[PDB]
Amino acid sequence: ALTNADRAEIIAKFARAENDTGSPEVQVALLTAQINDLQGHFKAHKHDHHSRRGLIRMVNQRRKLLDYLNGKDHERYTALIGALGLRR
């Protein structure tokens, strides 16, 4: 699991301003980190359906935020997906 230091590092790397925590870039970066971290857990425990539900919710939330960011500003969307290595 990620800790406070890792989350603070992600927030500092992707913030758009001082004390910025709610921007779509920060939110998508945090969700991507959490999903990538949970991949390892779901490798070991194949039948944790109850936790896989929360994982699916995280994926859906990230997709919605990415769509909103693409609608608002295309350049920021491309920059963010390039930075995090997301295919779309």
Partner RNA sequence: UUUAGUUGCUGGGUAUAGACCCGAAACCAGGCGAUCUAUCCAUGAGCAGGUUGAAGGUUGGGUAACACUAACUGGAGGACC
In terms of CB distance, is 15 or 58 closer to RNA? 58
Shortest distance, position 71 Cβ to RNA, whole Å: 19
> How many secondary structure helices (H) and strands (E) does the chain include?
4, 0
In terms of CB distance, is 1 or 17 closer to RNA? 1
Q: Helices 49-72 and 24-44, interaxial angle, to 10°?
A: 160
**40 contacts RNA (rule: CB under 7 A):** no
Q: How many C-beta neighbours within 10 Å does residue 78 have?
A: 12
By CB under 7 A, name the binding residues for RNA: 35, 39, 42, 52, 55-56, 59, 87
